[PDB]
Ligand binder design. Structure first.
Ligand SMILES: *[C@@H]1O[C@H](CO)[C@@H](O[C@@H]2O[C@H](CO)[C@@H](O[C@@H]3O[C@H](CO)[C@@H](O)[C@H](O[C@@H]4O[C@H](CO)[C@@H](O)[C@H](O[C@H]5O[C@H](CO)[C@@H](O)[C@H](O)[C@@H]5O)[C@@H]4O)[C@@H]3O)[C@H](O)[C@H]2NC(C)=O)[C@H](O)[C@H]1NC(C)=O
Ligand SMILES: *[C@@H]1O[C@H](CO)[C@@H](O)[C@H](O)[C@H]1NC(C)=O
Length: 485
């Protein structure tokens, strides 16, 4: 049980403070109880609460109080920091014709020199919707391959990427090829990951019921981010207490990037609309991928985010097969883990393979990285109650029998004098009992009310009388023995 404090300079004049602990657990059908629950003001002994200062006052429950605390599973929430967006699978297209016919060195050359208004691949622009030549993206026009001798050794070595037949002397036969970088419809958003925060929910049910010798219910929710809640017009407050910091050994994903599918540039591709659908089977296919598998600058080949500079500047580009520089993309990680998921094995990139990923309440374009855990831990919950309506005051003053005045005259009439000593204006109720034993009919006790400093006399109708003074609540103050007859 808790004590009662005066409300120092949380709205109250007097305040009941109680501290409880609640712990979470995996209950089952058989053992279904993890709750912390306590009742107050129901038994005849726990009906009063000691005061912090001035013990002469105790507070009795006006209602019987039911408080129940339950704790959710413990979740690790990883803060996300937006990096940029990344294409799912870039692909190379090869052009060997244009609107004039086959590409060749004589009458219809492949054009990819920077600055030309005539690139066979076209340019890309930044912003993408622009056609201003000043907004052309460097290296976006791709590059040409032809039936010449490159700087390195060989005879017509640049024919390989475009599949050119450098032996036919024929104007229907193209002798040059253009190579352009393109991005498929699906774009992922990538996030950096911070160190996790702990999260849980504590439900506090406070139920007031009448005394017995209708019920009311208020629910307070508590969390590490919102640790203080109120109820019944600020008359009640609950607060979770402790170091909510993550523990040692919690998994860290700092070196990784959170890859969330976000955008379809061509919404007419049903496969793309599926990849961004916020349903649990696809959200569990979002990916954590090591940062060193990504190129944020796009000038590194065979890395997530590869772009025009890496594609065009690859050494001996024309001697390489198509789609070179474009390996190991998000689509390849997806297919790799998808086949593992489709065969009951454990992959390396899907979030479902990292733990109990929370898919609830996720809104598109506002993703989160949250994992439920094994953890069970106790959390102290401090409760405060405005005592104005929960308790009425009960005062306890000292009280003596005035021995120099309380006598017995020789008919049974006991003249008793009681004094309450001290200062105060709050009366206290006292019970006076008499136990005259030898052949004396019973004497009924009587309640007397005395404020500090007051003094009253009451008469009670070979013997001896045991007279006892009792407090308003389960105490005895003074006892005097007096002879009779
Ligand atoms: C906040 O906290 C307070 C108290 O801490 C809660 O109030 C308490 O709610 C309890 C249930 O909600 C309630 O206990 C009930 O007592 C009733 C009898 O007085 C029961 O009818 C009631 O439901 C039963 O529970 C049984 C458990 O299995 C169940 O078997 C039973 O169903 C069988 O029995 C009926 C016949 O009664 C058949 O018709 C039926 O077909 C089944 O055979 C039934 O479900 C439960 O036992 C407490 O009395 C409440 N205490 C107080 C002080 O009010 C609040 O609910 C909490 N608030 C919130 C929001 O959580
Ligand atoms: C929880 O921990 C226990 C041992 O402490 C382990 O056996 C169990 O597999 C764990 N479960 C989960 C879901 O982490």
């Amino acid at each position: 049980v808790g004590s009662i404090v005066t409300c120092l300079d949380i709205p109250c004049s007097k305040k009941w403070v109680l501290t409880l602990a609640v712990e979470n657990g995996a209950t089952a059908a058989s053992s279904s109880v993890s709750a912390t629950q306590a009742v107050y003001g129901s038994s005849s002994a726990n009906a009063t609460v000691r005061s912090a200062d001035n013990p002469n006052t105790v507070y009795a429950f006006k209602y019987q109080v039911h408080i129940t605390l339950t704790k959710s599973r413990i979740r690790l929430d990883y803060p996300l920091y937006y990096q940029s967006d990344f294409n799912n699978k870039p692909y190379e297209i090869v052009y060997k014709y244009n609107q004039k016919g086959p590409l060749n060195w004589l009458d219809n050359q492949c054009v990819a020199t920077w600055g030309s208004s005539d690139p066979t691949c076209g340019y890309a622009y930044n912003p993408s919707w622009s056609t201003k030549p000043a907004d052309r993206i460097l290296y976006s026009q791709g590059f040409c391959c032809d039936c010449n001798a490159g700087d390195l050794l060989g005879l017509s070595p640049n024919r390989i990427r475009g599949g050119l037949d450098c032996s036919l002397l024929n104007f229907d036969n193209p002798t040059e090829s253009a190579h352009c970088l393109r991005f498929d419809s699906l774009w992922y958003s990538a996030f950096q990951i911070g160190e996790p925060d702990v999260n849980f929910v504590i439900l506090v049910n406070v139920t007031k019921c009448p005394l017995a010798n209708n019920c009311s219910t208020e629910i307070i929710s508590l969390s590490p981010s919102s640790p203080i809640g109120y109820a019944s017009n600020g008359k009640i407050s609950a607060q979770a207490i402790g170091d909510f910091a993550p523990w040692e050994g919690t998994p860290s994903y700092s070196e990784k990037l959170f890859f969330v599918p976000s955008v379809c540039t061509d919404t007419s591709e049903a496969w793309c609309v599926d990849r961004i659908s916020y349903i649990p089977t696809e959200i569990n296919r979002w990916m954590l991928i090591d940062n060193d598998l990504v190129t944020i600058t796009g000038d590194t080949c065979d890395k997530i985010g590869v772009s025009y500079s890496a594609f065009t500047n690859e050494g001996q580009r024309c001697e390489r097969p198509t789609q070179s520089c474009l390996h190991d993309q998000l689509q390849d990680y997806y297919d790799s883990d998808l086949a593992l998921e489709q065969t009951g094995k454990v992959g390396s990139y899907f979030v479902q393979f990292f733990g109990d990923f929370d898919v609830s309440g996720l809104t598109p374009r506002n993703p989160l990285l949250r994992f439920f855990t094994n953890r069970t831990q106790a959390t102290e919950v401090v409760l405060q109650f405005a005592a104005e309506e929960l308790f009425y005051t009960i005062y306890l003053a000292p009280a003596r029998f005035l021995r120099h005045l309380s006598k017995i005259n020789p008919g049974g009439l006991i003249d008793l004098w009681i004094v309450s000593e001290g200062t105060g204006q709050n009366a206290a109720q006292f019970t006076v009992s008499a136990s005259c034993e030898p052949n004396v009919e019973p004497i009924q006790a009587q309640i007397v009310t005395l404020a500090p400093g007051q003094l009253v006399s009451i008469s009670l109708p070979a013997g001896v009388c045991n007279c006892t003074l009792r407090n308003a609540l389960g105490q005895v103050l003074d006892v005097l023995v007096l002879e009779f007859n």
